[PDB]
Symmetry: C2
């Protein structure tokens, strides 16, 4: 029932789209496992990133974009709704002005659009998780 | 021919021991894949770490120890012998005073012993790599 990780899926997004991910960190929070979700402009892994969401479980979350190969202004959050050793459900909704990140049904992070979500062609979910579900509305 | 990752093996070390790892990052350096090698005091993942070696490919290496659950003084290196998109051979040798880390046959990092290497009971190799070989002399 596990999906391969790194997980790559071609995707198209617009206002109203939701990306839902169900997974579990591979190790305890003391070990600082990571989760990364990247919305790419092309199927290639080295392409630009419209939205980069990286969790360091139990510590912090960083968000950014990678434009013409360069990381832009990093946004950091210490909000940590993820629970040690538990399965999580993460949903990323495309709103007119921003992305809204729900964790286990709780609004947890937002990121204003820097590039139109229509530029997205691929989503990659990777780092230290097992993945059971991935869906795009 | 691939080994499972995270990879955990019971181990005993002393002066003269060598831990050899052969693997490949799962993604390009632009994506900053990580490699982590931890020498633990017990088979449990949450146990103390005598030697923590973490690579952020193309950026930096950090080394530390985790004693009674707390990270101690971090050591950082910008030395980056690892090559983008290539298979690497990493060897960690236990010398009387320190660990010596060879990357593709080149001495690349050292870390003075903070705890006797005889305290090690397990080695864990994890993060964003595929692993083809793991050996302890």
């Amino acid at each position: 029932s596990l999906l391969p990780v790194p997980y790559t899926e071609a995707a198209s997004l617009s206002t109203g789209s939701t990306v839902t991910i169900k997974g579990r960190p591979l190790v305890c929070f003391l070990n600082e496992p990571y989760l990364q979700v990247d919305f790419h402009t092309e199927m290639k892994e080295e392409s630009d990133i419209v939205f980069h969401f990286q969790v360091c479980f139990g510590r912090r979350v960083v968000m950014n974009s990678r434009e013409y190969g360069a990381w832009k202004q990093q946004v950091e959050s210490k909000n940590m709704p993820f629970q040690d050793g538990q399965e999580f459900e993460l949903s990323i909704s495309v709103l007119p002005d921003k992305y809204q990140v729900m964790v286990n049904g709780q609004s947890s992070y937002t990121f204003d659009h820097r590039i139109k979500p229509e530029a997205v062609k691929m989503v990659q979910v990777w780092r230290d998780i097992s993945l059971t579900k991935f869906n795009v509305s």
